């Protein structure tokens, strides 16, 4: 199924859609303000994230760097990004039931929306100004709020034991985005949908 990845910001991002060990369709392409981009995630992709990388520079070959969502310099993102990232997590068909969700488990970088394109379900969003209303010890240097996990690296933040709960750093991403995973275990905000359904991943929605 398809995934329109719309840039709606004022600044050029570099979208990216990948899984564990493989890119999706192409991998990730530059996006001037308003540029739309269509791809086709192979049906049955478990572990599919789409995100945006800001302040990236490249060369001909396809090898550079990104202040956010960097993934080994590979414009065509094969891996997941370097943490500080708002993710459109998804797993597709999964027993005739599709699964999508925004997440601030790996921080936040870009107000995102993950609406479905069909008549299958409602979508989600994460529009609020996190990066601005950031708590001091998260506002990353580059730009964007890292997550407590990546910043501090405690079991309580990154959830190793299995038994973890909300925090003040997780209750910041919740206060602002009530419809995205703050901590790794949060009362799932996932939305289930029909299998073989398409999606719009509008970065910077509402303007
Ligand atoms: Cl890091």
Swiss-Prot record:
GO cellular component term of the entry, any: cytoplasmic vesicle
UniProt keyword rRNA processing, yes or no: no
Subcellular location(s) per record: Cytoplasmic vesicle
SUPFAM superfamilies assigned to the protein according to its UniProt record, in alphabetical order: Osmotin, thaumatin-like protein (SSF49870)
Keywords noted in UniProt: Cytoplasmic vesicle, Disulfide bond, Signal, Taste-modifying protein
Chief localisation class: cytoplasm
Disulphide bonds in the chain: 9-204, 56-66, 71-77, 121-193, 126-177, 134-145, 149-158, 159-164
Known role: Taste-modifying protein; intensely sweet-tasting. It is 100000 times sweeter than sucrose on a molar basis.
Family under the similarity heading: Belongs to the thaumatin family.
Protein name according to UniProt: Thaumatin I
Organism: Thaumatococcus daniellii (Katemfe)
